[PDB]
Structure formats: C-alpha cells, structure tokens
Amino acid sequence: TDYTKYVNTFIGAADNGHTFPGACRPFGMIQTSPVTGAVGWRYCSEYVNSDSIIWGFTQTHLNGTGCMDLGDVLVMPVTGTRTRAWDAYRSRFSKKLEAATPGYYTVELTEPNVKAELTATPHAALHRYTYHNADSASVLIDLQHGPTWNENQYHSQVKECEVNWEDAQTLTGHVRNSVWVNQDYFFVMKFNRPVTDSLYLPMGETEKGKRIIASFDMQPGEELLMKVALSTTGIEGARKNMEAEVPAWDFEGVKKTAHDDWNSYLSRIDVTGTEDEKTNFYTCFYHALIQPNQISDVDGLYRNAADSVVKAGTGTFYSTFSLWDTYRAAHPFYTLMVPEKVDGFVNSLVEQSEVQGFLPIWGLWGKETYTMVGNHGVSVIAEAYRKGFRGFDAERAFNAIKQTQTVSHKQKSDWETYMKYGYFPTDLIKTESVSSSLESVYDDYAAADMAKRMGKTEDAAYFSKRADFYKNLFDTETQFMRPRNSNGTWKTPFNPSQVAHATGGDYTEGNAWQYTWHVQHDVPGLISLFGGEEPFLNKLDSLFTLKLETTQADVTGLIGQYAHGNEPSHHITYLYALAGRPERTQELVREIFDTQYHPEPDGLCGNDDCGQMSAWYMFSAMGFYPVDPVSGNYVFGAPQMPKIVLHLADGKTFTVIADGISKEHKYIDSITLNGEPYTKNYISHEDILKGGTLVYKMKLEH
Ligand SMILES: [Ca+2]
Ligand SMILES: [K+]
Ligand SMILES: [K+]
Ligand SMILES: [K+]
Ligand code: NA
Ligand code: NA
Ligand code: NA
Ligand code: NA
Ligand code: NA
Ligand code: NA
Ligand code: NA
Ligand code: NA
Ligand code: NA
Ligand code: NA
Ligand code: NA
Ligand code: NA
Ligand code: NA
DSSP states (O other): OOGGGGOOTTTTOSTTTOOOOSEEOTTOSOEEEEEEEOSSOOSSOSOOTTOOEEEEEESOOOSSOSSOOOOOOEEEEEOSOOOOOTTOOOEEBOSTTOEEETTEEEEEETTTTEEEEEEEOSSEEEEEEEESSOTTOEEEEESSOOOOSSHHHHTTOEEEEEEEEEETTEEEEEEEEOSSSOEEEEEEEEESSOOOEEEEOOOOTTOOSOEEEEEOOOOTTEEEEEEEEEESSOHHHHHHHHHHHOSSOOHHHHHHHHHHHHHHHHTTEEEESOHHHHHHHHHHHHHHTSOSEEOSOTTSEEEOTTSOEEEOTTSOOEEOEEHHHHTTTHHHHHHHHOHHHHHHHHHHHHHHHHHHSSOOSEEETTEEOOOSSSOTHHHHHHHHHHTTOOSSOHHHHHHHHHHHHHSOBTTTBOHHHHHHHTSOOTTTSSBOHHHHHHHHHHHHHHHHHHHHHTTOHHHHHHHHHHHTGGGGGEETTTTEEOOBOTTSOBOSSOOTTOOOBOOBBSSSSSOHHHHTTOOGGGHHHHHHHHTSHHHHHHHHHHHTTOOOSSSOOOOTTEETTEETTSGGGTTGGGHHHHTTOHHHHHHHHHHHHHHTBOSSTTOBSSOOTTTHHHHHHHHHHHTEEEEEGGGTEEEEOOOOSSEEEEEOTTSOEEEEEEETOOSSOOEEEEEEETTEEOOOSEEEHHHHHTOEEEEEEEESOO
16 A cells, blocks of 8 residues: 555645645655745745745755754746846746655746656755746756745855856855754755856845856756755765765656655554545654654764764764654654664764763754753653663763753753752743753653663662652642742742743743643652642643633634643643543543644644654554653553554554544443453553554443
8 A cells, every 4th residue: 555645745834834845755854845935024934835936945844843944955947037136036836736745746836937846865855847938947046045034034044155066067065054053064966957057146245145047958848857965064975975865867766765765664554544534644654754854974974063074873863853842752653663763863862962961952953952941852862761772872871861960051951050949940040940840850750760770779869859859849729830939939920821932931832731730750749749639630620621811812722721732731631541530531632633633734733843743643543642751651542543553663563443433432431452351541662562452442421
C-alpha cells in the first residue's frame, strides 16, 4: 500500500498550523517549498493556503514553529523584463493546479507562465521549471530573502554574502544571517543549461545579500533543471553533498527515492479507519518525521555552536530540537517507531552541550535560541537511557545533564536563586517564574532517574530532593500553582486566568489554570496536595468549563481554560483516568479528535510545534499517552480508530483494536492484552515492544 497518498502536506498551511507544503526527506536538511504572501507583511510562516501570490521557493523550513524559520536561498522563474524592483518578480497561481505528495510539490506560476516542480534529497533541492513562455527565460536567485516579522528586519538580515560563478552552469556562495539564529550556510547551485547572461540587481543600502538574474536560451515548452545543495561547513562540503545525492539530473529518480523513503517510515503503522481518519493520522506521522533536521555533510562534518567545523561522533549531526514541546510525546514516539534515530539525537544533544556548557534548550542550525523554558533535553536523554538505548556514552550524557541542572546558564536557569528558595521567586525573576520552576522540576526528576539507573547514589539523592520542589508553589488556599515571593508570601493580586507572554507574567504561553497540573512525574503527589481524588477532580471539572467573557478573543483550541495548542495542557485530559475517572478522559480525547484535527489546510487548532501536536494525536489515537515520558508508561485514554497496527523494529507487531468504536460508543468497557484481562491504568514500553494485541471493548454506557 502507498501510505503517502494519505499525507496532505497542505494541512496546517494556515495561521494556526505553520506547516509547509513543499518537498523534503524525513529528518532532512532540505525543505524546498513556496513562499507566499498577501497584502502587507505577515509576521510568521512562509506559506499559507489562503494566499494567492508566490514570491519564490526557499530550501529550508521549520514545521509548525511560532515564528522562527530558516527560509534560505529564494529562487523564482522569471520571463520577460529582467531588471525590476526586488518585489516585482512575484506571481499569482491557481489552487487547482497546485499539488503535493511527500517528496514533491508542483504549481503553475501565472505571471512568468512557468510550471514549477520541486523534489529533494537530504542535502539538495532539485527543481524542474517548464517555460510555457521562454522569452528571456531567467531565474531570480535572491540571497537577501529570509523569514522576518517585519520589513526593516528583512532588508538588514544578511550580515555577509559572497558568490562566485565557477562556470556557465555553476554558482557557489556563502551567506551569514542573524534573525532568529546566527546562521552560516554555503551552497553549490547548478543548472542543466548554460547561463547566457547574468545580472546583479542593485541592493538597498542595508542589504548585504545579492539578487541575481540568470538567463537561458530556451524555446516554449522547454525545461530547465536547477539543483542546489547546502552545507554548514563550506562550498566543498556542499559540493560533496550534491555529488552523493544528485550527481546528474534524474528528477523522476529523486522524486521516487523520496517517495520510497517516506513510505519506509509511514508503512510502520497500518491504520484502519475512514479516509479522513487515515489522512489525519498519516499527515501527523509525516509532520513528526520532518525534524530533527540533519545539518551535517555526508562525511559527518558540521559547523558547531563555537563556529568550528568538527566531525559528528556518529557520522550524523542533528538540530531543530524544539524540546519544550517535543519531550512530551514526539520524543517518546521516536523511541517506539523511529528507534534507529534516538541514539543519533542523544549524541547531537551531548556534543552541543560539550561546546556551549548545557544541553540544547531549543537547538537550531547547531546553535542555541533559548526559546521557551526548562532544559528538556534532560528528559529526552534520561528517557532514552531508561528505555535501553546504549548507542551513546552514558557518562558523557549524564555529565551533560548534571552540568545543565547545576551550572547556571541563559536565559532562565539561575540555579543559585533556584536552590536558595526552592523555586524561582516572582519578585526576583521578572517572567515565567512558575513555569520555569515546575518545568525545571521535571528535568530534576529525569536527572534523578538516570542517576539511579547508573548507580550514582549521591547524585540521585540530590536530584530527588529537587524533584519535590513543585510542592513549594502550590497554594492550598486557592488550589493553584501560584507565583511566590522571595519573602515566602504568595503573589497578590493573583489572576489564575491571566495569560502570560514573557506583556510578561509568571507562566509560559498560558496561565495558572494550565500550569497547576504540570507535575507529570508525581501525579499522586499532586492529588495529595489537593487533599485527594475528590477535590482534584472537582478542580479539573472547573478547568474544562471556565470561559472568559471580557478577554481571550480567539478560543481556538480551548475547552474552558484547557488549551489544546499549549503543550503544558497536553497531559491534562489523562489526569481524570489517573484520579479514578477514566470515562472523562475517554470523553475529552474524543472531543479533541472531533474538533481540533481535521484533514484540511485550516484544519488544525494550533501550530504543529515540530511534530508535538502530531505525536499527541498519534498516541491518543492508539488509546495511550506518555504523561510521564521518562517513566516509559503510557496512560490509557481511549483509542480513536477501529484498528492500528505497529510494526516494531525487530519484526514484532503490536495490534490495537477498538472493538465496537462508533460515534456514541466511545467509552471503554474492558481491556485485554494478549487475550487476558488487563486492569492497570497504563501499559509499559516493554509490554508494547514484546508485541501482541491490545483490545479495547468499546461501549455507550457511562
Ligand atoms: Ca504551542
Ligand atoms: K514574514
Ligand atoms: K535564514
Ligand atoms: K490543489
Ligand atoms: Na505582493
Ligand atoms: Na498552480
Ligand atoms: Na526564448
Ligand atoms: Na538566520
Ligand atoms: Na530563453
Ligand atoms: Na553542514
Ligand atoms: Na522525553
Ligand atoms: Na508527556
Ligand atoms: Na526520542
Ligand atoms: Na543537536
Ligand atoms: Na541544535
Ligand atoms: Na527520549
Ligand atoms: Na504531555
């Protein structure tokens, strides 16, 4: 079966989603995709489905980020007049003739009257342009272009740019830009026809990039092929990358390689359901596998955070580690379904820690962006170790964890303050005091877990003490995780609904209603703080029913104050089950499936967040979720499709059956594992990997 047919790459091409529709390989360096715009300047995302103007095609993209992006090397077919203003090469296009499938994108560009087709290898983009008009057939190569939230930034974003025509078919160059991350890239670009003339357009005073119009001698209907390979290291690295992957001009072959690569992953799960269910699921699977992105050359060389070219220990170095999001479910998903990449990811995290002094917080292009809170590379490593991954040096990995959690670092990890108080005090830490505290607690728990498993008794005791610090922020009077002053008192006034954006506030992208539940490692301890299951459940009921009338304009993703697009919320629906009311978890997961994920461009409730929203969906569809990722226990909610078969790495299969699932039959009567009654509220990683059959008998009665 061809599972790629269920991937709709336009899903999430919207303000809520921030996906890209163009061609990439799983975990690749190239995401070659259209840049679109409308009227005025859009803050974020290079493509949205409602736009009807294409600026060109860039070679690098992040999937589902809030605003960070790469968007390097804009190319655009041009016909007619060669010299124009920088913004005058754009084109309308029809939706009818735009199409995509994993590894491939095509669109008809009305203005130049050119069809564009894009495919990709791990390090190269390959384009095929058909010039219906071949009048001064040309290509714009725009090295100034990049994704910025305003136009002033756009015209100043390049710090350095050098290009060279090596011959009539080959352009090479180097760009450094600054916006979201300090990025150096090098490229080799080749055309399959000789360039007959080239022109540099005049650049703005602050523009350090270049805009090149390259021309070709062509006739109507003729094709031009362009390939471009990138490198972090140098032009020779880019050349070697190209030679390894696109040595000639085999467009159909590259497209097929990409198709087959995607199917080699997607075929690891067989979903039975409606067409829409399969489209939702396989598109999620696709989104989860776009990143982390390989950025090393084919020989393992990469440019690291010290701006030095070095060799990856494993031969491959990855970045794009959106760890605040992904530690929660995307990383667990890789441990199950993409285990052969986990050791490589851990090695990449550790190597960068050894350069910068702490694990990547939000790693991009091998650099640090410091985005969001916590240090959740710690969870990823501890989880991998707990689950039996041994393709990394555990001593080096634990040293990275220990340095991360005990040596203070930017932007938020002031451990002297933290250990003085047992929390980050709101009066001393201007923003995110509570979110940074509670999220750091999880990392200390993870550190303790790995320490215990390595027999590091003293370290385990140290980190276990820190893992209890969540208790220091729970106000029993109001029953919220509440900001706390350095003098011990609670912050007043206190509005538990007030959303924080570091406008400021003590939480991250949310409020106390969400963060009160952020104790993934010790849900029993949190229940105890509440005074038992009954008051805990009463407070959850309030979370899911509280709507605000004077604020909170877009309620996108919200069920009361539960915010499905905000990652702190992702484990919350499962807390009902963990407090002895699983039928409510079952109802709520179904509600999320009914409302928050549809197989349409505008069908997502929120940005995909580098595969985290997608991994949430895939786990929840199977009926279990990693509330506590390091534990390797998956807490039951309810399956959402009739049957899901996992093909595991050793040839075993784990089959999930939602026996009798329907619109109203959404509750679980009973669970059997390998034919025997199963009464625990979770299933272990080990039990999944053993293979077999998990049958949820579905019912109406509740
Ligand atoms: Ca989010
Ligand atoms: K923009
Ligand atoms: K860039
Ligand atoms: K279409
Ligand atoms: Na425009
Ligand atoms: Na089109
Ligand atoms: Na011509
Ligand atoms: Na950049
Ligand atoms: Na021509
Ligand atoms: Na590189
Ligand atoms: Na994790
Ligand atoms: Na989690
Ligand atoms: Na992982
Ligand atoms: Na890395
Ligand atoms: Na990184
Ligand atoms: Na992990
Ligand atoms: Na979660």
